């Protein structure tokens, strides 16, 4: 449930989670289809699963 951002991701709404390359994100929900939910720096939202790598 711990992943590291491979790329920057810029949220397009407040359902989505922004992060920078190298940020550590904690996965809160795994679904298939290319989107996971996670939390970073007190915010929770969805992000592309192929934008991160498991630690």
């Amino acid at each position: 449930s711990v992943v590291r951002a491979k790329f920057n991701f810029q949220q397009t709404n407040e359902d989505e989670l922004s992060f920078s390359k190298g940020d550590v994100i904690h996965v809160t929900r795994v679904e298939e289809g290319g989107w996971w939910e996670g939390t970073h720096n007190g915010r929770t939202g969805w992000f592309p699963s192929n934008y991160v790598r498991e630690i």
Partner: peptide
């Protein structure tokens, strides 16, 4: 507490 729905849009491609 209510959680955000999974995006309906397709996941974006990784930056090239």
């Amino acid at each position: 507490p209510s959680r955000p729905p999974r995006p309906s849009r397709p996941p974006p491609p990784t930056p090239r």
